[PDB]
Design a protein around this ligand. Structure first.
Ligand SMILES: CC(C)(COP(=O)(O)OP(=O)(O)OC[C@H]1O[C@@H](n2cnc3c(N)ncnc32)[C@H](O)[C@@H]1OP(=O)(O)O)[C@@H](O)C(=O)NCCC(=O)NCCS
Ligand SMILES: Nc1ncnc2c1ncn2[C@@H]1O[C@H](COS(=O)(=O)NC(=O)[C@@H](N)CCC(=O)O)[C@@H](O)[C@H]1O
Length: 180
């Protein structure tokens, strides 16, 4: 499979899902910084990304988790730029289940980048039999994520009551799945 390269997973002619590396720290930090105000609306961690060293720490931990298959953290490269992150936040090996996370900078939204990335990951891990069940969990009112999940052929399984906390407030999540 020539799409599985040493540096990452080639989705199409424009998108590569890069294995994390320290060289990416600067660009990743700057991207997060540019999007901090909007990102804080849907994710908890951006509020605390205050310097490049925070992105270095994230990369270091991500490489450890990737090595040990605890997670699969990938940096989305669109053309020449890092566009965001797509991940298996958690890999449950015993139950062959992967929990998916993602984000894109504002300048990279509306381009199908995450839909294309997810479809590629599900082909690679799902059609190979490594993962049986893929899961997306996001806050109910996350309109754009819901659209992405449905676009990728996920099914809504239910609402997880008061399951995600942002800034001290618990919010309901939709749980979507795609089963091979
Ligand atoms: C969730 C998020 C990644 C969605 O980004 P997105 O760009 O809408 O994601 P997709 O890859 O599914 O792209 C779909 C959009 O691209 C457009 N489109 C353009 N080219 C396309 C292509 N090749 N394939 C599919 N759609 C394409 C679609 O029309 C759609 O645009 P629309 O929203 O104007 O209808 C983004 O809103 C985000 O980063 N949010 C903050 C982080 C977050 O909430 N994460 C999830 C928390 S659990
Ligand atoms: N410090 C950091 N720098 C750069 N990216 C970071 C980051 N911390 C998390 N990410 C990436 O953000 C994406 C979304 O992950 S996330 O915010 O934790 N939320 C979720 O994945 C949702 N499933 C909500 C959590 C839940 O299920 O309860 C995931 O792609 C995740 O890898």
């Amino acid at each position: 499979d020539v799409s599985l390269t040493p540096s990452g997973i080639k989705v199409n002619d424009e998108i590569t899902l890069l294995y994390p590396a320290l060289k990416y720290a600067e660009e990743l930090y700057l991207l997060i910084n540019q999007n901090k105000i909007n990102f804080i609306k849907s994710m908890a961690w951006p509020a605390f990304v205050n310097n490049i060293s925070d992105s270095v720490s994230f990369i270091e931990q991500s490489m450890i988790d990737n090595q040990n298959e605890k997670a699969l953290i990938l940096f989305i490269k669109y053309k020449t730029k890092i566009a965001g992150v797509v991940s298996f936040n958690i890999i449950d090996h015993a139950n062959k289940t992967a929990y998916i996370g993602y984000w894109l900078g504002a300048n990279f939204q509306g381009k199908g980048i995450v839909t294309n990335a997810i479809n590629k990951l599900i082909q690679e891990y799902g059609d190979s039999g490594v993962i049986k069940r893929f899961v997306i969990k996001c806050i109910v009112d996350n309109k754009k994520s819901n659209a992405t999940a449905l676009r990728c052929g996920f099914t809504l399984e239910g609402v997880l009551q008061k399951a995600e906390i942002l800034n001290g407030v618990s919010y309901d999540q939709n749980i979507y799945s795609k089963v091979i």
